[PDB]
Design an enzyme around this catalytic site. Structure first.
Site, PDB file in Angstrom:
ATOM      1  CG  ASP A 195      79.907  90.937 100.075  1.00 27.07           C
ATOM      2  OD1 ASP A 195      79.794  92.119  99.703  1.00 27.07           O
ATOM      3  OD2 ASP A 195      80.121  89.999  99.291  1.00 27.07           O
ATOM      4  CG  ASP A 197      82.286  92.655  97.067  1.00 25.39           C
ATOM      5  OD1 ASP A 197      82.088  91.444  96.879  1.00 25.39           O
ATOM      6  OD2 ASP A 197      81.402  93.458  97.380  1.00 25.39           O
ATOM      7  CG  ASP A 267      83.496  87.737  96.288  1.00 24.20           C
ATOM      8  OD1 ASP A 267      83.927  86.568  96.290  1.00 24.20           O
ATOM      9  OD2 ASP A 267      82.948  88.263  95.297  1.00 24.20           O
TER      10      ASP A 267
HETATM   11  N1  LIG Z   1      74.099  89.304  90.729  1.00 25.48           N
HETATM   12  C1  LIG Z   1      75.331  89.822  90.810  1.00 25.48           C
HETATM   13  C2  LIG Z   1      75.919  90.082  92.085  1.00 25.48           C
HETATM   14  C3  LIG Z   1      77.125  90.681  92.103  1.00 25.48           C
HETATM   15  N2  LIG Z   1      77.762  91.059  90.936  1.00 25.48           N
HETATM   16  C4  LIG Z   1      79.015  91.890  90.939  1.00 25.48           C
HETATM   17  C5  LIG Z   1      78.778  93.395  91.038  1.00 25.48           C
HETATM   18  C6  LIG Z   1      78.942  93.655  92.524  1.00 25.48           C
HETATM   19  O1  LIG Z   1      79.278  95.005  92.856  1.00 25.48           O
HETATM   20  C7  LIG Z   1      80.049  92.680  92.890  1.00 25.48           C
HETATM   21  C8  LIG Z   1      80.036  92.260  94.335  1.00 25.48           C
HETATM   22  O2  LIG Z   1      78.747  91.668  94.629  1.00 25.48           O
HETATM   23  P1  LIG Z   1      77.911  91.861  95.941  1.00 25.48           P
HETATM   24  O3  LIG Z   1      77.048  90.677  96.142  1.00 25.48           O
HETATM   25  O4  LIG Z   1      78.935  91.954  97.128  1.00 25.48           O
HETATM   26  C9  LIG Z   1      77.044  93.211  95.922  1.00 25.48           C
HETATM   27  P2  LIG Z   1      77.126  94.797  96.149  1.00 25.48           P
HETATM   28  O5  LIG Z   1      75.743  95.321  96.452  1.00 25.48           O
HETATM   29  O6  LIG Z   1      77.746  95.425  94.979  1.00 25.48           O
HETATM   30  O7  LIG Z   1      77.896  94.981  97.523  1.00 25.48           O
HETATM   31  P3  LIG Z   1      77.343  95.106  99.018  1.00 25.48           P
HETATM   32  O8  LIG Z   1      75.880  95.336  99.116  1.00 25.48           O
HETATM   33  O9  LIG Z   1      78.186  96.261  99.638  1.00 25.48           O
HETATM   34  O10 LIG Z   1      77.774  93.801  99.649  1.00 25.48           O
HETATM   35  O11 LIG Z   1      79.805  91.525  92.064  1.00 25.48           O
HETATM   36  C10 LIG Z   1      77.176  90.784  89.690  1.00 25.48           C
HETATM   37  O12 LIG Z   1      77.722  91.207  88.668  1.00 25.48           O
HETATM   38  N3  LIG Z   1      75.966  90.142  89.661  1.00 25.48           N
HETATM   39 MG   LIG Z   2      79.526  93.686  98.520  1.00 23.07          MG
END
Ligand SMILES: Nc1ccn([C@H]2C[C@H](O)[C@@H](COP(=O)(O)CP(=O)(O)OP(=O)(O)O)O2)c(=O)n1
Ligand SMILES: [Mg+2]
Ligand code: NA
Length: 343
Positions: A195, A197, A267
């Site tokens: 996604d 963010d 997001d």
């Molecule tokens: N289990 C979780 C999931 C997310 N968060 C936080 C940390 C993350 O970087 C942000 C965006 O999530 P995301 O689900 O977008 C994940 P992220 O891997 O950082 O981004 P992409 O792979 O580029 O999409 O939300 C948290 O604290 N606990």
């Molecule tokens: Mg993300």
DNA sequence: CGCTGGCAAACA
DNA sequence: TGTTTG
DNA sequence: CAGCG
């Protein structure tokens, strides 16, 4: 010398132990599926600590002094050293409960429990689940199955940048003073993501409904495919907003074609300007970095950290911070740059 | 040896 | 209120 | 499954 906490180490995107970490991610997934939480987290902790290494493990003498590595993980590492392949991880990839779990959870809105439920009912293919007349799907699963092909294909850098253009356009019309920052994986220097963010903020604001103004703007353009709105009310209580969307992104906006657009998960988080550092830290990630920031703060510092504030339990006071650097300095941590948070 | 392991909030 | 999302 | 108290 190496800390057991991700927040107390630098993890860039250069992984020298990818042969070891790919196997440990698989063994974490299998324990998540089998619902043995402790064993799952141990494989997750160990995969994370090997990603931080500025070098590749070539001998068992390399594993000495490395935290999150006990008897079971050391024996997994030993197997990849002698063979080059993991017998334990290879067995998991051929398991039918695991193959179904990885195929049913690939759908947005479907987690462990419904994927276990469908496997129990006798489901093997995503087409049989869709072609049923008794299953009651959530609005999330209905979206997950509608845009499945576009949703399983990752968001690349040119796409994240065109989504950035869309959000900044939308926000600037309702709050022209607002700061839009790309957070998540893309802020950690990643070239791909599941996604995109964002964090939206304003020092001069009115802000209590910007996400609702922005999403209604996309709905009037026919771009809001799905939406889930969230809210909230020295630090004091929240002013907070969040909007999780699926946006229609025309290929013309990105630098056979067929459809003319791609469904992307967006997001959008919105917080007050004085709460920006905490939100940046909380939504930049990674998930492992976040769970270890919390773990370290409570166990090492007698402090409580969340995406909005940092409380000192002993002094009974909320610790103020204008930047991510100030949060690290309060916590007694060496500043870790966003691209060094890939834990 | 037993306990902990990171969080929040929207749907159904 | 369990499930899934971030 | 691994670390701490
Ligand atoms: N289990 C979780 C999931 C997310 N968060 C936080 C940390 C993350 O970087 C942000 C965006 O999530 P995301 O689900 O977008 C994940 P992220 O891997 O950082 O981004 P992409 O792979 O580029 O999409 O939300 C948290 O604290 N606990
Ligand atoms: Mg993300
Ligand atoms: Na899923």
């Amino acid at each position: 010398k190496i800390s057991q906490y991700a927040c107390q180490r630098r993890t860039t995107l250069n992984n020298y132990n990818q042969l070891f970490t790919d196997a440990l991610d698989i063994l974490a997934e299998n324990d998540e599926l089998r619902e043995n939480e402790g064993s799952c987290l141990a494989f997750m902790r160990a995969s994370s600590v090997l990603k931080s290494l500025p070098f590749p493990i070539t001998s068992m003498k390399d594993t000495e002094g490395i935290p999150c590595l006990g008897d079971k993980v050391k024996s997994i590492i030993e197997g990849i050293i002698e063979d080059g392949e993991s017998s334990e991880a290879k067995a998991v990839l051929n398991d039918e409960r695991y193959k179904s779990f990885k195929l049913f959870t690939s759908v947005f809105g479907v987690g462990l429990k419904t994927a276990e439920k469908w496997f129990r009912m006798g489901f093997r293919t995503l087409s049989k689940i869709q072609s049923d007349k008794s299953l009651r799907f959530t609005q999330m699963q209905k979206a997950g199955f509608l845009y499945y092909e576009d949703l399983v294909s990752c968001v690349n850098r040119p796409e994240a940048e065109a989504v950035s253009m869309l959000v900044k356009e939308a926000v600037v019309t309702f709050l022209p003073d607002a700061l839009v920052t790309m957070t998540g994986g893309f802020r950690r220097g990643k070239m791909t993501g599941h996604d995109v963010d964002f964090l939206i903020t304003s020092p001069e604001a009115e802000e209590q409904q910007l996400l609702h103004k922005v999403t209604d703007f996309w709905k009037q353009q026919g771009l809001l495919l799905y939406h889930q709105y969230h809210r909230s009310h020295s630090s004091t209580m929240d002013v907070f907003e969040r909007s999780f969307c699926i946006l229609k992104l025309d290929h013309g906006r990105v630098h056979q074609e067929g459809k003319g657009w791609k469904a992307i998960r967006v997001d959008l988080v919105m917080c007050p300007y004085d709460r920006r550092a905490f939100a940046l830290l909380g939504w930049t990630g990674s998930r492992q970095f976040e769970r270890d920031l919390r773990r370290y703060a409570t166990h090492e510092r007698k402090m409580m950290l969340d995406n909005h504030a940092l409380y000192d339990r002993t002094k009974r006071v909320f610790l103020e911070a204008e930047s991510e650097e100030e949060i690290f300095a309060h916590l007694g941590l060496d500043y870790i740059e966003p691209w060094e948070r890939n834990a």
